[PDB]
């Protein structure tokens, strides 16, 4: 059913691998199972519902940042319904790793644009601050080196995850600020409600990511492909969907007590936030 | 001499391949040629060079982005020098595309960066506005784009060079626009020579990677992969090395004005620019 060889004679007591000649790739460990078929249905519901959400997002949402994302995904659950595991979907490399590229390029494409939104988490600014570019940088990083110790292993595979784990590290600690920031920077209502609840958003789903990595086939393989989709899926949905949700919802509600009361600031001390208020 | 299969009987008239059981990968394509001698010694030798004077640069050398690239470039031939075609430095996949990985994986670390860098050539600013986003998300989309074509094969190949190709036209087209502006915004002088250079560095060296890949192993093979090295070596050179000299050069210039005639400003039309002045 792959576009690589799956069909194979063993010879010689099973101390030879015979294959036709015929120009395609072969490995034992690309026919490894991708998992059971409860946790494939599992993947498939869950992708359903994320394309369908994203879609719903996508319909009812600059606030560009968000777009882009449910752009992304919805292109992505279109490449996974077709070619979730053609190559290079998934990349089946000499190692005999299977390397989720979908998700990597997703990440990629998707995390920093996040991570963008979460520097103007108000949507009001010409923001953007050397914070932000480490924030940037730091992300791409980490993606770079997960992505670089996915396609790797053994000892180098270690390394490079713990790159990425130094990078997130400093990914997640920048976050933080912002989201502290952020926090004292919006009205003193519901907006400090739904940055906390984005935060909570945030560090949960961003940071099962690399436990993910860690429980997946790119780990110590707890987790099936499968059963990596699920969870990935699910992380997707925190991160992705329900975090954008809020985040436009935030802006909403910036946007309107902005309209309302003016752009009225006052300085609060932590570095200097210029906090909204309604009043003189 | 590679950690996938190499050594294979052609069996049945060449009709069957048979391979040693021992749990490596195997396919033919990945056996081909790297290229001439030649090209691997000009290749190893621009390796050195870049390397030399990545280190030379690092040992020169906020302005955190080009020690930042440099510290990737001479990151990256410590691998080259002792991995450079071991999975994943080279992908090979199971489509049997080698896919430079080491060169798709530094793009990403160090292209938002030089980005970044572009973005504030002054070195003044808390300057990062929307536009500089719009460079960064479209350049790592270029890289995702690309490196998927080179992962891919026939159609999607073309389809994904194009949407890295739309993505970097995005790009150079904000880079443009970011450099006309620099060069309005620096002092008359030298300062405008250097910015006018980098523009020549910037979209000589970065129009030369789709053209690469159109001429590589991703593309229609004209190149070799040691002569695709050797260009990317070239225009590495270029684009990391070169200009981020003259940038850095740019911002001693423009601190050494700045310090001496002081931040002065008069106001110039394009959008609005804040010229530097001498006087009053
Ligand atoms: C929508 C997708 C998102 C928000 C993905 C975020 C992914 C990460 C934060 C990945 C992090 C990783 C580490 C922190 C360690 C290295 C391995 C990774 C790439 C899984
Ligand atoms: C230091 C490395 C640099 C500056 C690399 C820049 C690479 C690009 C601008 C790549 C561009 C591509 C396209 C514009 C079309 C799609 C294929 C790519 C990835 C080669
Ligand atoms: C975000 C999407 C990034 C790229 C994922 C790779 C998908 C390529 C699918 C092609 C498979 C095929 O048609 O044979
Ligand atoms: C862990 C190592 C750190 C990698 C993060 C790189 C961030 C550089 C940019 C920081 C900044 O000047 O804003
Ligand atoms: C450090 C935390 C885990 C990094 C993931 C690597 C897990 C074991 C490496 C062995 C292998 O996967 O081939
Ligand atoms: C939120 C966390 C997701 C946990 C992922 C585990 C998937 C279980 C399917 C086997
Ligand atoms: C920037 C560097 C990004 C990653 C390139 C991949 C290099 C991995 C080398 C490991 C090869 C090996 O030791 O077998
Ligand atoms: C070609 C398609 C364009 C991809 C570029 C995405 C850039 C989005 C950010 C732009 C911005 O609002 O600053
Ligand atoms: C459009 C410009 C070229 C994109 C590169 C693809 C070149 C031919 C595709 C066939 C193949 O490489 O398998
Ligand atoms: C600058 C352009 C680099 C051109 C690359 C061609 C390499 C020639 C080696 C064969």
Same mark, same amino acid.
């Given at each position: ?46 992708? +359903? ?16 940042? &968000? ?5 992304? &995904? ?26 989720? +590229?979908?998700?990597?390029? &997703? ?8 991570? #963008? ?27 770079? +080196? ?12 270690? #390394? ?39 935060? $909570?958003?945030?560090?949960?789903? $961003? ?64 570095? &200097? ?8």
């Amino acid at each position: 059913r792959m576009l690589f060889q799956t069909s194979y004679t063993l010879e010689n007591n099973g101390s030879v691998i015979c294959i036709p000649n015929n120009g395609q790739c072969f490995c034992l460990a690309w026919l490894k199972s991708n998992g059971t078929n409860a946790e494939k249905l599992a993947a498939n519901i869950l992708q +359903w519902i994320t394309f369908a959400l994203s879609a719903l997002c996508l319909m009812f949402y600059c606030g560009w940042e &968000e777009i882009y994302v449910a752009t992304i &995904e919805m292109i992505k659950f279109i490449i996974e319904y077709f070619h979730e595991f053609d190559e290079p979907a998934v990349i089946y490399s000499s190692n005999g790793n299977k390397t989720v +590229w979908l998700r990597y390029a &997703e990440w990629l494409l998707t995390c920093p644009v996040i991570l #963008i939104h979460l520097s103007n988490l108000t949507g009001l600014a010409n923001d953007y601050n050397k914070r932000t570019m480490g924030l940037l940088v730091s992300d791409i990083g980490t993606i770079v +080196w997960g992505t670089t110790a996915a396609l790797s292993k053994g000892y180098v595979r270690v #390394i490079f995850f713990l790159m990425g784990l130094c990078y997130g590290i400093y990914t997640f600690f920048n976050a933080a600020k912002v989201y502290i920031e952020a926090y004292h920077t919006v009205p003193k209502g519901r907006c400090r409600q739904v940055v906390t609840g984005m935060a $909570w958003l945030f560090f949960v789903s $961003w940071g099962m990511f690399p436990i993910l990595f860690i429980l997946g086939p790119e780990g110590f393989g707890v987790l099936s492909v499968y059963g990596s989709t699920v969870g990935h899926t699910i992380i997707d949905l925190m991160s992705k969907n329900c975090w954008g949700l809020l985040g436009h919802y935030l802006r909403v509600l910036i946007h309107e007590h902005i309209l309302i009361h003016g752009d009225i600031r006052k300085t609060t001390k932590l570095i &200097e936030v210029e906090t909204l208020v309604e009043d003189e």
